[PDB]
């Protein structure tokens, strides 16, 4: 229902940088969104939203599993 406290694969403390990663990401999207309705963001076909540098600035390493779970985890608060 939230970003996990630790990475499901290895157990790196993803959760302690989770909340920040959420909120900051939003402004980044607001920077790159562009004349488009929010619910149509995953259909724009012209977006280049990259979160590599944000996660790097968070101090999280370049592990595939950790960044996968940080980026892809759904939040229950945002759908209910």
């Amino acid at each position: 229902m939230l970003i996990p406290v630790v990475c499901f694969t290895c157990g790196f403390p993803i959760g302690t940088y989770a909340a920040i990663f959420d909120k900051a990401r939003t402004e980044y999207i607001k920077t790159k969104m562009g004349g488009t309705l929010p619910q149509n963001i995953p259909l724009d076909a012209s977006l280049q939203i990259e979160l590599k540098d944000l996660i790097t600035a968070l101090g999280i390493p370049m592990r595939v599993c950790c960044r996968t779970h940080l980026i892809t985890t759904l939040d229950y608060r945002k759908y209910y």
Binding site: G35, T36, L37, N40
Partner: peptide
């Protein structure tokens, strides 16, 4: 038109 559909 595709960009207008996405903009609502």
């Amino acid at each position: 038109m595709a960009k207008d559909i996405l903009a609502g």
